[PDB]
Amino acid sequence: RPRFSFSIAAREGKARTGTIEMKRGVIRTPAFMPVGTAATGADIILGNTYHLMLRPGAERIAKLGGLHSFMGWDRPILTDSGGYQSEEGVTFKSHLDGSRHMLSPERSIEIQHLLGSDIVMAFDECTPYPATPSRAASSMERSMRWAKRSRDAFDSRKEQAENAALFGIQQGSVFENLRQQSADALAEIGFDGYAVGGLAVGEGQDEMFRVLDFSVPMLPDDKPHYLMGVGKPDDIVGAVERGIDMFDCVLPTRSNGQAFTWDGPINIRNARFSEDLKPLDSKWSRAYIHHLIRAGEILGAMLMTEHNIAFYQQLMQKIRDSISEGRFSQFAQDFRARYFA
Amino acid sequence: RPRFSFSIAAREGKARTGTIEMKRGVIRTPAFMPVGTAATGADIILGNTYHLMLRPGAERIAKLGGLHSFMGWDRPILTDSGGYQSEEGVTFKSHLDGSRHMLSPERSIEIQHLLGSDIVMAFDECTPYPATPSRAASSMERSMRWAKRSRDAFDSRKEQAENAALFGIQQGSVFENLRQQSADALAEIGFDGYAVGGLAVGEGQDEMFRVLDFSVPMLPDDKPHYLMGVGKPDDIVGAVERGIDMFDCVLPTRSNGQAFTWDGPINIRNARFSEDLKPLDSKWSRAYIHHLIRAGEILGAMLMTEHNIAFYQQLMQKIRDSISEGRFSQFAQDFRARYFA
Ligand SMILES: [Zn+2]
Ligand SMILES: [Zn+2]
């Protein structure tokens, strides 16, 4: 396999389905990327850089052979840049041990190099919401300067440049002109993939979709589009309808008794499930999972998490199949009707 | 298969290895019986009657099809009697909902009937330690009267009498004459198996082994011997050396970062494991499990629990094989030398 190749196999409206080929495997898109520590299907997993920086540290991970060996996962891994202050970067103190840490585009790339990830994120600034036009512009402009520094740091590390891929992150808050300037700057630098940053930060689904409507077409069509921090199943479907190819979200693993189902989210702890013999996956019964989680049994939490990860992967498979078959619009309509019934 | 048949295949000293045949499966002995809710090898699992009485209640379990259907386990299940006050039984209030509950030999047998378990424990009184001779005698005498009531209640339930088995529980604290009276009373009533009760209640290993030395030979040789509440791996080995066939213990599942290994227990949270690439099972590394548990990841707890359950089952397999091969004394010596090194 090549270091990085993205190929679009089929399209319906703005939606696309295809593959990213990398040295460690093929990623089918649209893709959901689960947190790698969530459970023992997914073509790529996430490593949480911020956490790994603090425990056990990137140098220790490298000493143990890198994240692939450490976690027992031989397929692609994506890491964030750690930033989610000055022009140089950000400084912060660790609550775990008081140790001092600085983070900059250069240090972020080096941390991700030591972790050994396959998809490396440029170091950006996620602009808070809401933001004034002036503050969104200033933040986006800094992120673009940091994207160039990330590009140069990545290219100066031969093993990384030859074996990994680098994604740039579009910013600009909710402002069309700033999103355009950001897309132009990123395309001029040149990246393997393009993330839509700065969303899922409190703006709500209608506003997020509005921003995606104009923002995704500004990115290079022939490269993957990654919507960071999204999301709920209905967010994913609507974002695919708007041209997004890749997703990450803490929700399936964070979801406390919450299970995702084709009939919407449910809280399995609710007493209405205490005698419900229907399987959670529409074959442990809802009643048994309810019992385990109400009893505080770790098995219940593990089964819930596995159910949610599996639900998300079944959702992505149905999305990919329906786009490839030219019935994604109908799938999206049927999905929403049942999920929100 | 018959309702209940115990056959001894081989012996070494007081140690025995063999099989219990029941309608739902064969149990190889010496056997370790894990808690059924601990994870998704074991020939029999435990159902915790006291917990199930309170949530969701025995009647609700029966409405859901019994414990086998509820838990997805089609092999044998053992339940305790729930008692672990008057001559009639015990009264208590539920902390979960304030509901009132009484427990008696008759009600305990009926609860275990509703749960559908295959091995039913007689309803006894576990005498606290230490106990004076008079109090141990009074408690044991009550337990023997309750054992007869348990026998009669079990026999009056046709489905239970024809398909399940009933174990009696020897009491008598640390006193040889009371242990003898208890064994005689239980054998006169007649049970399918005999438990040694009243141990692992604070007396310490030397005293427990001392009591087992005289107590186990008092039970019928041709029936299984179940040591309740035991125990650590070294407790199991020494109890097998004294004629015990069956074990239950919350330790593998309770063990918080503790892993059982052939080199003794270890606490995987200790910093000395942060860079230790040796597998936990002497193939997740100790370093990765350490990381998961220090990060609070449920995956780490699940992997620890699965490791401990597997360790216990490997221990029991080695015990069974060594008795069958006539090398159990050597195994016990080698086990202790390495476990305590
Ligand atoms: Zn499922
Ligand atoms: Zn192991």
Coordinates of N, CA and C in Angstrom, one line a residue, chain A residues 42-131:
Chain A
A42 N -14.1 -1.2 13.1 CA -13.2 -0.1 12.9 C -12.0 -0.4 12.1
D43 N -11.7 0.5 11.1 CA -10.5 0.5 10.3 C -9.4 1.3 10.9
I44 N -9.7 2.2 11.8 CA -8.7 3.1 12.4 C -9.2 3.5 13.8
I45 N -8.3 3.6 14.8 CA -8.7 4.0 16.1 C -8.0 5.3 16.4
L46 N -8.5 6.0 17.5 CA -7.9 7.2 18.0 C -7.0 7.0 19.2
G47 N -5.9 7.7 19.2 CA -5.1 7.8 20.4 C -5.2 9.2 21.0
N48 N -5.5 9.4 22.3 CA -5.7 10.7 22.9 C -4.3 11.3 23.3
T49 N -3.8 12.2 22.5 CA -2.5 12.8 22.7 C -2.4 13.5 24.0
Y50 N -3.4 14.3 24.3 CA -3.3 15.1 25.6 C -3.1 14.2 26.8
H51 N -3.9 13.1 26.9 CA -3.8 12.2 27.9 C -2.5 11.5 27.9
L52 N -2.0 11.0 26.7 CA -0.8 10.3 26.6 C 0.4 11.2 26.9
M53 N 0.4 12.5 26.6 CA 1.4 13.4 27.0 C 1.6 13.4 28.5
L54 N 0.5 13.3 29.3 CA 0.6 13.4 30.7 C 0.8 12.1 31.4
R55 N 0.4 11.0 30.8 CA 0.6 9.6 31.3 C 0.6 8.7 30.2
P56 N 1.7 8.0 30.0 CA 3.0 8.0 30.7 C 4.0 9.0 30.1
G57 N 3.5 9.8 29.1 CA 4.4 10.6 28.4 C 4.8 10.0 27.0
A58 N 5.0 10.9 26.0 CA 5.2 10.4 24.7 C 6.6 9.7 24.6
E59 N 7.6 10.1 25.3 CA 8.9 9.4 25.3 C 8.7 8.0 25.9
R60 N 7.9 7.8 26.9 CA 7.7 6.5 27.5 C 7.0 5.6 26.5
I61 N 6.0 6.1 25.8 CA 5.3 5.4 24.8 C 6.3 4.9 23.7
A62 N 7.2 5.8 23.3 CA 8.1 5.5 22.3 C 9.1 4.4 22.8
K63 N 9.5 4.5 24.0 CA 10.4 3.5 24.6 C 9.7 2.1 24.6
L64 N 8.3 2.1 24.8 CA 7.6 0.8 24.8 C 7.3 0.3 23.4
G65 N 7.7 1.0 22.4 CA 7.5 0.6 21.0 C 6.6 1.3 20.2
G66 N 6.0 2.4 20.7 CA 5.0 3.1 20.0 C 3.6 2.6 20.3
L67 N 2.6 3.4 19.9 CA 1.2 3.1 20.3 C 0.7 1.8 19.7
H68 N 1.1 1.5 18.5 CA 0.6 0.3 17.8 C 1.0 -1.0 18.7
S69 N 2.3 -1.1 19.0 CA 2.7 -2.2 19.9 C 2.1 -2.1 21.3
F70 N 2.1 -0.9 21.8 CA 1.6 -0.7 23.2 C 0.1 -1.2 23.3
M71 N -0.7 -0.8 22.4 CA -2.1 -1.1 22.4 C -2.5 -2.4 21.7
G72 N -1.5 -3.1 21.0 CA -1.8 -4.3 20.3 C -2.7 -4.0 19.1
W73 N -2.6 -2.9 18.4 CA -3.4 -2.5 17.3 C -2.4 -2.2 16.1
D74 N -2.5 -3.0 15.0 CA -1.5 -3.0 13.9 C -2.1 -2.2 12.8
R75 N -3.3 -1.6 12.8 CA -3.9 -0.9 11.8 C -3.7 0.6 12.0
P76 N -4.2 1.5 11.2 CA -4.0 3.0 11.4 C -4.5 3.5 12.7
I77 N -3.8 4.5 13.2 CA -4.1 5.3 14.4 C -4.1 6.7 14.0
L78 N -5.1 7.5 14.4 CA -5.1 9.0 14.3 C -4.9 9.6 15.7
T79 N -4.1 10.6 15.8 CA -3.9 11.3 17.0 C -4.2 12.8 16.8
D80 N -4.9 13.4 17.8 CA -5.0 14.9 17.8 C -3.7 15.6 18.2
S81 N -3.7 16.9 18.0 CA -2.5 17.7 18.2 C -2.2 18.1 19.6
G82 N -3.2 17.9 20.5 CA -3.0 18.1 21.9 C -3.4 19.4 22.4
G83 N -3.7 20.4 21.5 CA -4.0 21.7 22.0 C -5.5 21.9 22.5
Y84 N -6.4 21.1 21.9 CA -7.8 21.2 22.4 C -7.9 20.7 23.8
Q85 N -0.8 31.4 26.6 CA -0.8 31.3 25.1 C -0.1 32.5 24.4
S86 N 0.7 32.1 23.4 CA 1.4 33.1 22.6 C 1.5 32.6 21.2
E87 N 2.1 33.4 20.3 CA 2.4 33.0 18.9 C 3.3 31.7 18.9
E88 N 4.1 31.5 20.0 CA 4.9 30.3 20.0 C 4.1 29.0 20.2
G89 N 3.1 29.1 21.0 CA 2.3 27.9 21.4 C 1.6 28.2 22.7
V90 N 1.5 27.1 23.5 CA 0.7 27.2 24.8 C 1.6 26.5 25.9
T91 N 1.5 27.1 27.1 CA 2.1 26.5 28.3 C 1.1 26.1 29.3
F92 N 1.4 25.1 30.0 CA 0.4 24.5 31.0 C 1.1 23.6 32.0
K93 N 0.5 23.5 33.2 CA 1.1 22.6 34.2 C 0.2 21.4 34.4
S94 N 0.8 20.2 34.6 CA 0.1 19.0 34.7 C -0.5 18.9 36.1
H95 N -1.8 18.5 36.2 CA -2.4 18.3 37.5 C -2.0 16.9 38.0
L96 N -1.5 16.0 37.2 CA -1.1 14.7 37.7 C 0.1 14.7 38.6
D97 N 1.1 15.6 38.2 CA 2.4 15.6 38.9 C 3.0 17.0 39.0
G98 N 2.3 18.0 38.6 CA 2.9 19.4 38.6 C 3.9 19.7 37.6
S99 N 4.3 18.7 36.7 CA 5.3 18.9 35.7 C 4.9 20.0 34.7
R100 N 5.9 20.7 34.2 CA 5.6 21.7 33.2 C 5.7 21.2 31.8
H101 N 4.7 21.7 31.0 CA 4.7 21.3 29.6 C 4.4 22.5 28.7
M102 N 5.1 22.6 27.6 CA 4.8 23.5 26.6 C 4.3 22.7 25.4
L103 N 3.5 23.4 24.6 CA 3.0 22.7 23.4 C 3.0 23.8 22.2
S104 N 3.6 23.4 21.1 CA 3.8 24.3 20.0 C 3.5 23.4 18.8
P105 N 3.4 24.0 17.6 CA 3.3 23.1 16.4 C 4.4 22.1 16.3
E106 N 5.7 22.5 16.6 CA 6.8 21.6 16.5 C 6.8 20.5 17.5
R107 N 6.5 20.9 18.8 CA 6.4 19.9 19.8 C 5.3 18.9 19.6
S108 N 4.1 19.5 19.1 CA 3.0 18.6 18.9 C 3.3 17.5 17.8
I109 N 3.9 18.0 16.7 CA 4.3 17.0 15.7 C 5.3 16.0 16.3
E110 N 6.2 16.4 17.1 CA 7.2 15.5 17.6 C 6.5 14.5 18.6
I111 N 5.6 15.0 19.4 CA 4.8 14.0 20.3 C 4.1 13.0 19.4
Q112 N 3.5 13.4 18.4 CA 2.7 12.5 17.5 C 3.7 11.5 16.8
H113 N 4.9 12.0 16.5 CA 5.9 11.1 16.0 C 6.3 10.1 17.0
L114 N 6.6 10.5 18.2 CA 6.9 9.5 19.2 C 5.8 8.5 19.5
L115 N 4.6 8.9 19.4 CA 3.4 8.0 19.6 C 3.3 7.0 18.4
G116 N 3.8 7.4 17.2 CA 3.9 6.6 16.1 C 2.6 6.6 15.3
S117 N 1.7 7.6 15.4 CA 0.5 7.5 14.7 C 0.6 7.7 13.2
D118 N -0.4 7.2 12.5 CA -0.5 7.2 11.1 C -1.1 8.5 10.5
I119 N -2.1 9.0 11.2 CA -2.7 10.3 10.8 C -2.4 11.3 11.9
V120 N -1.7 12.3 11.5 CA -1.2 13.3 12.4 C -2.0 14.6 12.2
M121 N -2.5 15.2 13.2 CA -3.2 16.5 13.1 C -2.3 17.7 13.3
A122 N -2.5 18.7 12.4 CA -1.8 19.9 12.6 C -2.2 20.6 13.9
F123 N -1.3 21.4 14.5 CA -1.6 22.0 15.7 C -2.3 23.3 15.5
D124 N -3.5 23.5 16.0 CA -4.4 24.6 15.7 C -4.9 25.2 17.0
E125 N -5.8 26.2 16.9 CA -6.5 26.8 18.0 C -8.0 26.7 17.7
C126 N -8.7 25.9 18.5 CA -10.1 25.8 18.4 C -10.8 27.0 19.0
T127 N -11.4 27.8 18.1 CA -11.9 29.1 18.5 C -13.2 28.9 19.3
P128 N -13.3 29.5 20.5 CA -14.6 29.3 21.3 C -15.8 29.9 20.6
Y129 N -16.9 29.4 21.0 CA -18.2 29.8 20.5 C -19.1 30.4 21.6
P130 N -19.7 31.5 21.3 CA -19.6 32.3 20.1 C -18.3 33.2 20.1
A131 N -18.0 33.6 18.9 CA -16.8 34.5 18.7 C -17.2 35.6 17.8

